[PDB]
Amino acid sequence: LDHVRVGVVITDPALEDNPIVYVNQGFVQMTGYETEEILGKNCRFLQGKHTDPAEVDNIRTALQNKEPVTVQIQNYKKDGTMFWNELNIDPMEIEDKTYFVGIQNDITKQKEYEKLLEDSLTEIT
Amino acid sequence: LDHVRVGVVITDPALEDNPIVYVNQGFVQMTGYETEEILGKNCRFLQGKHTDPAEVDNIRTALQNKEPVTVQIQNYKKDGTMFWNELNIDPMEIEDKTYFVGIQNDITKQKEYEKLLEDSLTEITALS
Ligand SMILES: *[C@@]12=NC3=[C]C([C])=C([C])[C]=C3N([C][C]([O])[C]([O])[C]([O])[C]OP([O])([O])=O)C1=NC(=O)[N]C2=O
Ligand SMILES: *[C@@]12=NC3=[C]C([C])=C([C])[C]=C3N([C][C]([O])[C]([O])[C]([O])[C]OP([O])([O])=O)C1=NC(=O)[N]C2=O
Incomplete structure (x- = not known):
């Protein structure tokens, strides 16, 4: 539960409107859309x-x-x-x-999580 | 912690020994091999x-x-x-x-950091 992962997509420009034909779970988690709500x-x-x-x-x-x-x-x-x-x-x-x-x-999240670590390490002194 | 691009590789398992048919620059940077030394x-x-x-x-x-x-x-x-x-x-x-x-x-720096935090946790706990 809750991790930063990169999103990876491949699209096929030989198909109508250059649809996504591959997506990783990272992008599913990043965007909140299920695999089948992204593909196509x-x-x-x-x-x-x-x-x-x-x-x-x-x-x-x-x-x-x-x-x-x-x-x-x-x-x-x-x-x-x-x-x-x-x-x-x-x-x-x-x-x-x-x-x-x-x-x-997800630059918003990468920052959020780096600051949590930042602030934790501060709290140790 | 690590701050480098991610590598992407595509292989074709229908070809003998499932060779790499695509590699991005992230993976060239990470591995130290140029695309010509990776593909195939x-x-x-x-x-x-x-x-x-x-x-x-x-x-x-x-x-x-x-x-x-x-x-x-x-x-x-x-x-x-x-x-x-x-x-x-x-x-x-x-x-x-x-x-x-x-x-x-590339999670090398994260693993180094994890190991140290784990060791410290072990040490703290062994104490009072
Ligand atoms: C989407 N990422 C993404 C990844 C690839 C491989 C490609 C080909 C496109 C994207 N887009 C851009 C989008 O598909 C489109 O090309 C642009 O909006 C410009 O074309 P239009 O027809 O709209 O003028 C990505 N767009 C995003 O917003 N987020 C990404 O992750
Ligand atoms: C290599 N990444 C990687 C990326 C893809 C798309 C595929 C299919 C395989 C890899 N490998 C695994 C390797 O090619 C092989 O499949 C395994 O060694 C198991 O088979 P063998 O015959 O060797 O027992 C990757 N291996 C890596 O070490 N690093 C990766 O980045």
Whole structure:
């Protein structure tokens, strides 16, 4: 119970709207969506009210150009909780066919947990 | 604690000895091998003296069963230094074909820290 784990997705851009075709349990736990509530969707489903449209634009462009991209973007869990998602996307090839691998980091949580350790270690003196 | 990128590897178990067909830069950085020195190999090439056969067994069994697995296993960089690899492998299906995807997290500093806190807890408790 309660751990920080990276989220990993693979999407298939040869399919309609570049859907997620693989997701790790880390991302299930990070976002609050079950595996089958993630698979088959475009990753944009995690965006919401305060997602910066300019950074969404910059992802779209990167993916169009098959350029690796890293960006911090506001994302939303199934229960509505906002989190900062540090997203790295890598274009890649498997069957001499292109896929995208995304690695997601819950920066909000990584900070929260590092501070708990920080504050604990203080309390020891 | 550890502050490095995670490694991702994809293998194709339909090819002989389940070779690596994709590796990200996170794993290049972590292992000290360039992509050209990784692709086409089996991931076991990162193992060495202190790699516990029990954990190798755990991985071998899960892949044979086509089931997810997580282990903490000792691996080695090209320069010979040992790192602790918290390794998660899932099967996956891409365009109706099966592959494995592996996620590698360097937990060497966390393990060092855990050991010290564990020792201190043991020591505190032995006292009054
Ligand atoms: C989602 N991560 C993610 C991972 C990969 C491998 C890829 C290809 C995309 C994402 N997205 C971005 C999203 O799918 C989309 O590409 C962008 O919104 C831009 O395109 P549109 O059509 O919307 O203009 C990710 N988006 C997220 O918000 N969070 C991530 O984890
Ligand atoms: C290697 N990671 C890794 C990633 C994937 C996707 C797969 C399928 C395997 C690995 N391995 C395990 C290794 O290749 C092998 O399966 C095991 O050694 C068990 O089989 P054998 O024949 O050797 O008994 C990984 N092994 C590692 O040591 N480090 C990883 O990062």
